[PDB]
Amino acid sequence: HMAALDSLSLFTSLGLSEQKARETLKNSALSAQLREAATQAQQTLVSTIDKATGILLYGLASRLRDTRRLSFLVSYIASKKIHTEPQLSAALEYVRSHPLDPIDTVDFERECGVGVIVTPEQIEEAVEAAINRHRPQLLVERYHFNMGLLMGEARAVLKWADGKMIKNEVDMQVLHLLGPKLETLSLMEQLRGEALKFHKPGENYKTPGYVVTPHTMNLLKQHLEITGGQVRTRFPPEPNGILHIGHAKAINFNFGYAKANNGICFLRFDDTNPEKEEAKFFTAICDMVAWLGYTPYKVTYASDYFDQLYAWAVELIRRGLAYVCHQRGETLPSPWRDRPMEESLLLFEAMRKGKFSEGEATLRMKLVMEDGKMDPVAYRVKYTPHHRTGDKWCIYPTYDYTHCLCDSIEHITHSLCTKARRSSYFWLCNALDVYCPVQWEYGRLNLHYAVVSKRKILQLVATGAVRDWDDPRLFTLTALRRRGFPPEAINNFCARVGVTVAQTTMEPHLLEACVRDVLNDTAPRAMAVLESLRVIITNFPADIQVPNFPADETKGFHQVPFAPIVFIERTDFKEEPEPGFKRRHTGYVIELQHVVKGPCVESLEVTCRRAPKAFIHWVSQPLMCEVRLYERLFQHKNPEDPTEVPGGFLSDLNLASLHVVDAALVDCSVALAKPFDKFQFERLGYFSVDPDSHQGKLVFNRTVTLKED
């Protein structure tokens, strides 16, 4: 096939510049082995040879002096067992070193790092390391610093990593530090930029609605100097907000899109409005971010940008596109929108110097919107002290104004939100000739039987309907963690639906379907029961082996008490042995050799057995501990917002609520357990160490059953 080419044609098809191919075909001997090397390779390779694989054969051909060994080494570069330059340079040694004719495969493979895989984190941290080690010098010489050292020290740690991959990590991490030089399926295949038809960075000008102004090209030029063409996303919650399961699509999209595309995601707190701080929720937001597996590249506040927003707001006024208004709240046309410009500067200053009462004056943009709204407000006057900038500001930018220009300041590439007013986004940035991000709207998400407004929720916790806001029948993220859901479950959940055109409301049992698939492989098994009666064998002989989990005993086994006086549930031989029942899950069938009674069924007696009625759960020498039982909080497992028109979202409080099993009987393995540990309690359900457990007192939470009707 390929062995049929003119060499100049053959060489270029292996990935050599035409320049270096003219070079090479002057070399009769090199050129000879390169054709022979490629011939062999092709015969193994089948699908025409990749260029990258070609540069490997070219090195091989041009350095192998042994040449008894060519047919050998080529086999290792056809199957891409050798596929990096230091691997190739490794084998080039091993073969120069051993002229021994028969070469050990395993000695060879191991000393070239064949099965050896190197990870982006591993390189990231190697470079990180080198940077820190030089940070002072780096900061001062800026781009004059010899970047060679970094790749050196980086290479020093990672013997078998791609040289280009290391450069690109260096190049990136340096630009972060220096700044600019001024001279279903799986989720991160689902979130590949290519699999969404989202623009490559810098190429905003290919998206629907994007306005190309006369600066847009020089603006995108500057943009790429700042960002190295990297994807940048942001996730912008309220510092006092309360994340629910909706926000899981938000988190997974924004951090995950960045992850799947080698990018970064800023946790940008929206603190434009001045409030007193409640650290309860604030830490719980960073926590929940963490909990689902994501780490913000940087954590930032909108208040960080107040100076910048104000400067830009002043430009708006000068540019005739914004004015100071004296209309109040609650759309009537404003008497002031054509007031002279110098009149607006004067008044915006006065606003800033705190000369107007809250709402006596406002800055608005001079504009009518796609949906008819006139002159949206940019700045409001607020005198409540602000948690970060203190009392420095008494005027504040509005949410719409802000997170559009914050995106621009942070040089966001993909600005992802929930449906909208996108031509009004674009308007602002083009108004100031600043860089202009691309906005994509994805579909909202709200589950049935779920009410999540922080006000509506702090209503329940302030009646006793729920214990606190991590109460396991709330669908807040912090509650589902407490309830017992594992992170991966929620992530895999969005990996079942999670596209843009959703606006899909969803039934709760559909998620717990995922929680089972995850706990059935991760949660270990122990025996216990709630309404537990005491029973005795006839007379056995005076510690059994309960495995890790049934479907594979390849983990371990926990010892569990084997002696007289074991316990079991109700829902058993209840004297009147009606139709539909059965006889243990370990030991014997325990011949029921004697029955008892009460005034009730006070207790029972049995007999041993060995070597078939059924198998139930049991606990010999058990531990005493609480187990909380939860039921779907609302009567209507559909919206409690009056689509049903119950005329009250608080009437729908379904008096089912929580059934407390007090200290009941449980196994021995569940003793070293710390909070947020998950278990399958044989033949009951899935339970999780509640945060209030400790060695002294143990408490558990019922996550979900093992099927439905």
Q: Is 1 annotated as a binding residue?
A: no
Cα torsion angle, 573, 575, 577, 578, sign: negative
Q: Is 238 annotated as a binding residue?
A: yes
Q: Is 418 annotated as a binding residue?
A: yes
The answer to whether the beta carbons of residues 629 and 539 sit under 8 Å apart is no
Q: Is 248 annotated as a binding residue?
A: yes
Q: Tell me the C-alpha distance between 360 and 337, whole Å.
A: 15
Q: What is the DSSP letter of 635?
A: S
Q: In this structure, what are the phi and psi dihedrals at residue 568, rounded to the nearest 5 degrees?
A: -160, 170
The answer to whether the beta carbons of residues 134 and 149 sit under 8 Å apart is yes
Longest dimension (CA), the chain: 109
Give the residue numbers marked as catalytic. 238, 444, 454
**Solved using:** X-ray
Q: Tell me the C-alpha distance between 50 and 43, whole Å.
A: 14
Q: Tell me the C-alpha distance between 251 and 288, whole Å.
A: 9
Nearest to 304 by CA among 348, 351, 265, 270: 270
658, amino acid identity? L
The answer to whether the beta carbons of residues 623 and 639 sit under 8 Å apart is no
- Write the burial class of residue 458 (CB in 10 Å: 0-12 exposed, 13-18 middle, 19+ buried): exposed
The answer to whether the beta carbons of residues 316 and 400 sit under 8 Å apart is no
217, amino acid identity? M
298 - beta bridge partners?
266
Q: Is 453 annotated as a binding residue?
A: yes
The answer to whether the beta carbons of residues 223 and 175 sit under 8 Å apart is no
Q: In this structure, what are the phi and psi dihedrals at residue 699, rounded to the nearest 5 degrees?
A: -135, 150
Q: Tell me the C-alpha distance between 259 and 679, whole Å.
A: 31
Q: Tell me the C-alpha distance between 255 and 232, whole Å.
A: 9
Nearest to 99 by CA among 78, 68, 73, 127: 68
Nearest to 71 by CA among 94, 44, 48: 44
The answer to whether the beta carbons of residues 540 and 593 sit under 8 Å apart is no
Nearest to 535 by CA among 587, 612, 610, 613: 587
Q: Residue 545's Cα: distance from chain center in Å?
A: 39
Q: Residue 526's Cα: distance from chain center in Å?
A: 31
Nearest to 620 by CA among 583, 582, 586, 662: 586
Q: Residue 311's Cα: distance from chain center in Å?
A: 36
Nearest to 437 by CA among 403, 416, 407: 407
- Six token digits for residue 598: 């009460």
DSSP assignment of 46-57 equals -SPPPHHHHHHH
* List of residues 6+ apart from 616 with CB closer than 8 A: 568, 569, 572, 582, 583, 584, 585, 683
Could you tell me the end-to-end alpha-carbon distance of the chain, in angstroms, rounded to an integer? 62
Q: Tell me the C-alpha distance between 236 and 680, whole Å.
A: 37
597 C-beta neighbours (distance < 10 Å), count: 10
632 C-beta neighbours (distance < 10 Å), count: 15
The reported resolution of this PDB entry, expressed in Å, is 2.7
Would residue 464 be called left, alpha or beta, if left means φ above 0 and alpha means ψ between -120 and 50 degrees? left
Q: Is 250 annotated as a binding residue?
A: yes
Specify the fold of 120-176.
Answer: Arc Repressor Mutant, subunit A (1.10.10)
- CB-based contacts of 383-391 (< 8 A; 24+ apart in sequence): 383/354, 383/358, 384/274, 384/275, 385/274, 386/271, 386/274, 386/303, 387/239, 387/271, 387/274, 387/275, 387/276, 387/277, 388/271, 388/301, 388/303, 389/303, 389/306
Q: In this structure, what are the phi and psi dihedrals at residue 541, rounded to the nearest 5 degrees?
A: -100, 130
SS3 503: coil
The answer to whether the beta carbons of residues 15 and 9 sit under 8 Å apart is no
Q: Is 353 annotated as a binding residue?
A: no
- Six token digits for residue 573: 């031989």
- Six token digits for residue 196: 């969404």
- Six token digits for residue 355: 């000369």
Q: Is 542 annotated as a binding residue?
A: no
In degrees, rounded to 5, the angle at the alpha carbon of residue 546 between the alpha carbons of residues 543 and 549 is: 165
- Distances 697 to 453, 623, 627, 690 between C-alpha atoms, Å: 34, 10, 11, 11
613 C-beta neighbours (distance < 10 Å), count: 11
Q: Tell me the C-alpha distance between 507 and 603, whole Å.
A: 44
Q: Is 22 annotated as a binding residue?
A: no
* List of residues 6+ apart from 33 with CB closer than 8 A: 61, 64, 67, 70
